[PDB]
Design an enzyme around this catalytic site. Sequence first.
Site, PDB file in Angstrom:
ATOM      1  N   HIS A 166      45.097  40.234  41.830  1.00 24.49           N
ATOM      2  CA  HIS A 166      45.976  41.388  41.678  1.00 24.49           C
ATOM      3  C   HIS A 166      47.440  40.911  41.649  1.00 24.49           C
ATOM      4  O   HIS A 166      47.786  39.939  42.318  1.00 24.49           O
ATOM      5  CB  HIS A 166      45.724  42.432  42.771  1.00 24.49           C
ATOM      6  N   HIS A 175      41.033  44.691  32.812  1.00 24.80           N
ATOM      7  CA  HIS A 175      41.378  44.352  34.188  1.00 24.80           C
ATOM      8  C   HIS A 175      40.226  43.588  34.841  1.00 24.80           C
ATOM      9  O   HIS A 175      40.456  42.547  35.466  1.00 24.80           O
ATOM     10  CB  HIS A 175      41.704  45.633  34.976  1.00 24.80           C
ATOM     11  N   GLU A 176      38.988  44.072  34.671  1.00 20.55           N
ATOM     12  CA  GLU A 176      37.812  43.414  35.264  1.00 20.55           C
ATOM     13  C   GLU A 176      37.541  42.072  34.601  1.00 20.55           C
ATOM     14  O   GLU A 176      37.216  41.104  35.292  1.00 20.55           O
ATOM     15  CB  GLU A 176      36.564  44.319  35.184  1.00 20.55           C
ATOM     16  N   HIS A 210      39.768  39.576  36.192  1.00 17.57           N
ATOM     17  CA  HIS A 210      39.221  39.076  37.461  1.00 17.57           C
ATOM     18  C   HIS A 210      38.122  38.062  37.212  1.00 17.57           C
ATOM     19  O   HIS A 210      38.115  37.004  37.836  1.00 17.57           O
ATOM     20  CB  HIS A 210      38.645  40.211  38.327  1.00 17.57           C
TER      21      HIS A 210
HETATM   22 ZN   LIG Z   1      41.322  44.517  40.385  1.00 15.35          ZN
END
Ligand SMILES: [Zn+2]
Lengths: 343, 357
Positions: free
Chosen positions: A304, A294-295, A298
């Site tokens: 998101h 997830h990171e 980003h």
């Molecule tokens: Zn996030």
Amino acid sequence: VTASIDLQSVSYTDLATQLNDVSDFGKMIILKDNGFNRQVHVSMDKRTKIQLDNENVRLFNGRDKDSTNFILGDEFAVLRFYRNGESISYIAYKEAQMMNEIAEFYAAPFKKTRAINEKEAFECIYDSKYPVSVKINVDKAKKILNLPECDYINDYIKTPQEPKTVYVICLRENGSTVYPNEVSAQMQDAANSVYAVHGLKRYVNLHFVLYTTEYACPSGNADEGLDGFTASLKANPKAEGYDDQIYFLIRWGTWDNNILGISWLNSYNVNTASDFKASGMSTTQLMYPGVMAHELGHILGANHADDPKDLMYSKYTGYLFHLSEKNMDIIAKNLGWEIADGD
Amino acid sequence: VTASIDLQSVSYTDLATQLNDVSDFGKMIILKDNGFNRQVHVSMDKRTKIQLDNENVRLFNGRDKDSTNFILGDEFAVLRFYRNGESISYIAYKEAQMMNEIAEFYAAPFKKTRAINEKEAFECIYDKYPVSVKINVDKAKKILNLPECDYINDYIKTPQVPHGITESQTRAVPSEPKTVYVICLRENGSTVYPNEVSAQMQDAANSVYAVHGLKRYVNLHFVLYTTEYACPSGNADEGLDGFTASLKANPKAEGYDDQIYFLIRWGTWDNNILGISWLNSYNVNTASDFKASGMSTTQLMYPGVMAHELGHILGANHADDPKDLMYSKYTGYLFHLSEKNMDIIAKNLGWEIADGD
Ligand SMILES: [Zn+2]
Ligand code: PRO
Ligand code: PRO
Ligand code: PRO
Ligand code: PRO
Ligand code: PRO
Ligand code: PRO
Ligand code: PRO
Ligand SMILES: [Mg+2]
Ligand SMILES: [Zn+2]
């Protein structure tokens, strides 16, 4: 005649002997348990390299329909597969002392909650005595343990306005203890979330490395922790020359407000990567698979997503893949892809 | 700037960080030793697999002209190259305790013979405790004055049985190379050193692949475990006879009678015998009954003994050229030069002349 792994007695040596036999053309391996069988076609993951404190860790994949992955180091092996929508891991350490420590570590949270159906969530596996592996069904484990809600709210920051080898330099926070099976699972899920998008293995080959850093977050605040972490990288003479790589500060736990990780949003581009901008922080605990993925999403520009089944949903949901076409295009473009190249 | 390895301070982490960076397309690495500089193009050896007691060991090659090989495990790394016809190894162990033990182990024979150019044969490399050792095996053997350890008739013809000769079915290049395990068993009571065992395995595998493009037919997978078997005497023939018999009587080895086996030790046998094997005992179609077995020393000072014995297992006879791996006297060369031997070995691994190299 077909090779098999008996999950009622699976040890490190069982997994190592099978996985070490996997050639460049792959191998059929039958996963067996009471009431269970699965024929998986296993292949070496040639896209990702991993060292944990210079210990080489190899990844293995099943076919897409097999829903199976493996991790193999000299000290440990992991088998992870999905069955009836739940993720089950078999974690086996080679050394008796470490295997016993890992078994006690995973068993401990179930001591206060000695509720029904514990074996389906967690089980010590013994030779057909000390355990040879542990079975953890993370979906069933989280239901029994009733852990506090951990999420990704505001887990990003912005600065003001041959496949390429990209190192993902993971640094064990000063004073933190992390487990190799847990760190490598986060790295495998992070790498696989990237390669699943727009045939990105053609553009990038991720090389994870793990070392310890003297840096420690000065407080429980994730924003301040990440600001300090990126600053520590810029001020480290030993990191000079690697300012264009990706960095993660890793720990076992989480930050204030049960924040699982944090990263500089849209901070990595294959052409302009510099000044340690592509940095983040991530938990590596087993119960939260996909936080590093997830990171890393980003860092590669993903925002998101609105779908609760997306890896990039603002709440932690245990899904490991990008579903947002907008995020997929942003990530792939930051890695050198263009629509004319196809998937 | 091109990647480099400084041989005046080379450590395990130096070798590991460089070799772990080698991708599918290889990497240029400059080997530097004061004024000496060699640019080598390093690539992963994808033909050979090795586990030593389940520890994975990866091999790396330079180009043919680079005369350079590497070995990398989690616990140790080796750089081996040729300089003015001499084999030089840089051996680096990761753990400080193990590196100190390895340095003392290799330094110890030189305590009884202090030479002026001892550094040219052996040197502990620093940067108070060594990070690696440099051993020039050719110069080391001259300073240590070791007894002339030889092969003599280091083979026994594999037993045969009377039978009507069946026609040999002409086969094709397999779509995938055949995996052949080379099961090395550490003799009961023997101590072997991972850098030494893996160098013997690398030289053995490379001596096979150098013949008739044999990587198309076979991919060697070495494994090392300990056996309860120990030679009942110093006699190599009796030791090999007992070793093959121990394999046939081991229930755990059932199902693997068609693989290749070596009993390994650090030392040698009576009459300075370095190793011994059943001659012409391995064929990809008929391999059985643990026939493809031998014994080999693994000490650093005798590179290529496992390669020589593997050559005999694959059918190679002694060659007349002193530069041949299969010469009847130990000479330190690591490749087959005899065209007759090359054809015998390749045919036993499924090759035919119509397939080319
Ligand atoms: Zn996030
Ligand atoms: O090495 C293995 O496979 C396990 C670990 C504890 C004893 N046997
Ligand atoms: O019973 C369990 O927990 C898992 C399901 C498949 C194999 N073992
Ligand atoms: O117990 C068994 O049957 C296998 C053998 C090594 C450990 N698992
Ligand atoms: O591993 C952890 O979670 C601890 C928390 C603060 C520093 N490292
Ligand atoms: O760092 C990034 O991701 C942005 C994208 C274009 C170039 N810089
Ligand atoms: O390779 C290294 O970094 C350490 C130094 C001596 C022993 N191993
Ligand atoms: O003179 C030679 O070369 C022979 C060969 C075997 C032993 N000595
Ligand atoms: Mg180890
Ligand atoms: Zn011979």
